[PDB]
Subunit: 346 residues, 2 copies
């Protein structure tokens, strides 16, 4: 069941973790792997790479397994970094791209969001076109923290035009949650031979395995080979490898994982409509919504009430990112929000 | 319970893995983490960092947790690499240093082994002293593949002399197996404030957790801060983090892990002595010995008998590295070797 939270046992809706346990088949695989984990998972890593390759309709050399997509982002940046290069990003997006770009001494070119917190793709395209050196473009889709998608018919033709000296990193961490039919995975462009795309994926979100540390990149083999020089081989942990292989066969859990996230979303959105607090469309496992009280006060009052929400995401200073917990959790949070309103805490 | 091997179920003495399961307490920790691993192991990683800091008598900023020491070697090299830097290594050692040095575009300066396969420390010192640019020195102790130690009184005064523009990476993967009293961990030099040493350690060997991917670096905080820019945070897998925390408390297992290794070593050494095949002193969980037949023939005959031994380690072309299995495995291997001798296969 669900139990009312306290500060010692809070509802955790702070890091976009799946509030469900991983698949029972994946859990069995993970636990069974422990007795084997005195040894390296060498053959199993080969099997997982092959299975991911078939999933993306590419060959094995187009897959790089990494310890989460955290490592894929780093390797992608390191592989294509130089002191002449720029990273082109929307101003409000997932911070790892900029983090590793600054480590590489790159220019970071942030493009202001449009008036609906959408990506300004014309602005991103102009940031690349007017720069005479190499550009890395980092596109998170669906975006964190906003939750919104960028339509495929807006991204795909830009990428297909092959702007000179430009590598696109497309992070689809939250893609399996998506309901909007304008969203398409970029994967088929790689299957069809694109050499200017790195697709990053993870088992941390829909597969509910954040702590297991399994992600990967999909790209042309020449791109994967370059990225491979910035990781210490493919040496994923035994439990994560076996859990990943199992989760890939448990299509029933993946349907359930999406459906539970959909139910949670509507419970939150109901409360937000009742309170008349604007929110952005949610295509991941989180909602980004507006506040009329100071963010810091709201975070503190929620924390005292046993609920950990998202950190601040400047420059959206009056917005908060609320991850979607289980339905029972989101109802308790929705109702706390209603009680806050009565006393002006929201 | 021991059973005779087949080609489908071989004795695996090829990758210096501990042939013992992980500690029973560590396995239970690892299994119990799986239900929790929908979430990132954030606080648990902080606790493991603090526990390793206490173990090495340093503060937490002097520890960097990594996904095995493989990632530590990479990060250490990336942090200190430049196009003007050289890597100084013994000609016969663990190849990851050279590998990442080459990716960085560094000169790689290999110093021939002494006539007893020991490190030529005077040659390594001279290679640094002769080079006007920055140098990284990578010292594996006990060395892989030879298994030998370099006495502390030969290494410590070199490091303590602070050669200009030189960082020492000291890889003590196998150090808990060591019996030789001339061996000393470099750790106290970091506790005493050295800024030119990176110590790398792993849970993959004495702790028997190769497949759990947990290692770490110990260094001055300024050096750890630089290394940390080349990993995607400290985001170790949940089962590994909880297994590492438990294994650090199970001192009885560590004692047993070494003792079993010692027993296995003597079984192999007894066979080599009977066969009059020279070997090097073994201070890790493997033995480097000479062959009179071609290495490739010997590798093939052992594979066919269901025993997987080490790969070739040029330039020691007439030597093989045999990992130490359980005592019962090594008795069976030892007797297979005696039988091979009768038919000239060894
Ligand atoms: C867009 C995005 N990409 C990548 C990551 C990194 O996740 P992981 O290393 O668990 O795959 C996250 C954070 O969870 C994310 O939100
Ligand atoms: C000397 C040495 N250092 C480092 C490693 C890397 O091991 P891990 O990544 O499991 O810590 C090895 C394993 O082969 C090794 O032999």
């Amino acid at each position: 069941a669900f139990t009312a939270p306290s500060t010692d046992n809070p509802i955790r809706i702070n890091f976009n973790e799946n509030p469900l346990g991983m698949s029972p088949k994946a859990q069995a695989a993970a636990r069974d792997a422990v007795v084997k984990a005195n040894r390296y998972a060498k053959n199993e890593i080969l099997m997982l790479g092959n299975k991911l390759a078939a999933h993306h309709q590419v060959e094995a050399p187009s897959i790089l397994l990494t310890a989460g997509s955290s490592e894929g982002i780093r390797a992608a940046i390191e592989a294509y970094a130089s002191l002449e290069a720029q990273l082109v990003i929307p101003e409000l997006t997932y911070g790892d791209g900029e983090h590793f770009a600054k480590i590489a001494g790159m220019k970071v070119t942030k493009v202001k969001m449009l008036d609906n917190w959408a990506f300004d793709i014309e602005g991103l395209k102009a940031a690349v076109a007017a720069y005479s050196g190499p550009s890395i473009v980092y596109l998170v889709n669906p975006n964190n923290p906003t939750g919104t998608i960028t339509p495929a018919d807006v991204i795909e033709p830009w990428i297909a035009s092959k702007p000179a000296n430009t590598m696109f990193i497309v992070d689809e961490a939250y893609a399996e949650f998506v309901n909007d039919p304008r969203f398409r995975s970029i994967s088929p462009m790689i299957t069809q031979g694109a050499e200017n795309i790195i697709l990053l994926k993870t088992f941390s979100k829909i597969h509910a395995m954040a702590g297991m540390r399994v992600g990967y990149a999909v790209a042309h083999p020449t791109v994967i080979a370059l990225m491979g020089r910035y990781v210490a081989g493919e040496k994923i942990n035994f439990s994560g490898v076996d859990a990943a292989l199992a989760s890939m066969n448990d299509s029933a859990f993946i349907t359930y994982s999406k459906k539970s996230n959909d139910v949670s979303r509507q419970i939150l959105l109901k409360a937000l409509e009742d309170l008349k607090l604007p929110y952005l469309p949610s295509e991941g496992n989180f909602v980004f919504h507006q506040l009329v009280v100071p963010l810091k006060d709201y975070q503190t009052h929620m924390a005292d009430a046993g609920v950990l929400i998202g950190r601040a995401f400047p420059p959206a200073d009056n917005w908060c990112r609320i991850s979607l917990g289980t339905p029972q959790e989101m109802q308790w949070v929705a109702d706390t929000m209603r009680e806050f309103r009565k006393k002006s805490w929201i």
